[PDB]
Design a protein around this ligand. Sequence first.
Ligand SMILES: [Zn+2]
Ligand SMILES: [Zn+2]
Ligand SMILES: [Zn+2]
Ligand SMILES: [Zn+2]
Lengths: 87, 85
Amino acid sequence: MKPFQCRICMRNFSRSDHLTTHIRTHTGEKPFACDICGRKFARSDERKRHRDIQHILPILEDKVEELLSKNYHLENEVARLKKLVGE
Amino acid sequence: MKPFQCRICMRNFSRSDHLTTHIRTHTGEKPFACDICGRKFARSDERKRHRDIQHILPILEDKVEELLSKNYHLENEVARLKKLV
DNA sequence: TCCCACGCGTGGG
DNA sequence: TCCCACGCGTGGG
Ligand SMILES: [Zn+2]
Ligand SMILES: [Zn+2]
Ligand SMILES: [Zn+2]
Ligand SMILES: [Zn+2]
């Protein structure tokens, strides 16, 4: 059953929310803006895939590298300090 | 602009690689398996979106949490030893 | 409800 | 046919 019809192209859809997003293919409406870069998308899931992989993934990869490095510097300092005070 | 043709459904395509992956929709071929859960995909980019979000992001979050914890304990052995000093 | 995932067309490198 | 990103159909929960 496809009870929801687009009045522009007359295509029917099984879901009303899918009819709503489909209509944006005609209107060009992009309600969802990425908070990091500002790129606009027609649907929230399109914004999510974009942000997850284009931003979150590399930010977390960079963070891991950064912490490994900070932790290495701190360990070096802790080792030095330990000798200055004994241990 | 669509010089390639699928001989199963007669659809025309702009590119040879796109014709190739399209044919997989008819044959059911899924060459790409996710190394983490084993799920199969027709294309590498399908496998990538799945793996990146379903497995990798959670993994990275855990890693960052773990490293942040080690960091916090080290920034503590330091403020401390410098007190002994 | 309507986010989320996935399939798959299709451009770029 | 390689890798990838994004649009957009559409079911699951
Ligand atoms: Zn329409
Ligand atoms: Zn963005
Ligand atoms: Zn075909
Ligand atoms: Zn997987």
